[PDB]
Amino acid sequence: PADVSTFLAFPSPEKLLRLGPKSSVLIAQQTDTSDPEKVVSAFLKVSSVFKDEATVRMAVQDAVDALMQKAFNSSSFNSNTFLTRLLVHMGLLKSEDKVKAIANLYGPLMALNHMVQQDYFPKALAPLLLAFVTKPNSALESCSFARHSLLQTLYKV
């Protein structure tokens, strides 16, 4: 078996599955959703293990949904701050503070593709996400498939 902390510390598809059939609930339960920065961190760690394979895709998607539903449904949660910090950590938007942008954007983009189709997702954030995913960027240009997919999905929001 595994635990949420170890997973977030060293994310891997196997560890996510090892969390059990209730892994989605556990990730959300163990994340301090009162802190946008921590939600961004959890979202990126979870999506970093995304694989276009049945069991893993489902586990990642379900985890993202549990985490983001919990964060977004909080009347006090600042969704704008989440989006801004997400873009910063994905290296698509500059920041005053020093942050080490993630290396692979494949998982994050695929997780976003799923997230934006859910009812809990604030539609007001769609235009902002669309603006920064379409904006020229080397990292995005490398993950063309996932990028094109996310954009096509954003067009339907």
Partner: protein, 157 residues
Amino acid sequence: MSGIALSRLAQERKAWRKDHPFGFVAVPTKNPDGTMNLMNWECAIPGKKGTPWEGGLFKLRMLFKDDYPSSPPKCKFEPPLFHPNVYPSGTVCLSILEEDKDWRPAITIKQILLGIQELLNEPNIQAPAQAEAYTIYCQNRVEYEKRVRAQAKKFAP
């Protein structure tokens, strides 16, 4: 150990007082004891006539570090302004305001304030500091200009 910065700032104050662009304001704040705090200036930049920013007076704080002029001052609009190159915190981004980029000893307070004034109606869309203004600017220019005009009227002296 800010003696070098203070020497320079004392002279920039005298130079500014002797001659500066009309409508602009740049004055050192005061310490609790009544003395001048040359490391913290309260400034104001007038909107350029003929532009959607005309009529407005935008207040900003200029903060100098102890190693000035090796480093550029930090310029922050108070309150934060709606503009692609202004962080939500209010911090303004400009090549001449970055030590790693175009900041140099040849840069004066007048050049900085004129540079920021120019940036107002001529944003650097390739390097946005906020997602909000960038998104609107790129998706609906007419709406963007509408928001800019409203903001200029809001900060009209």
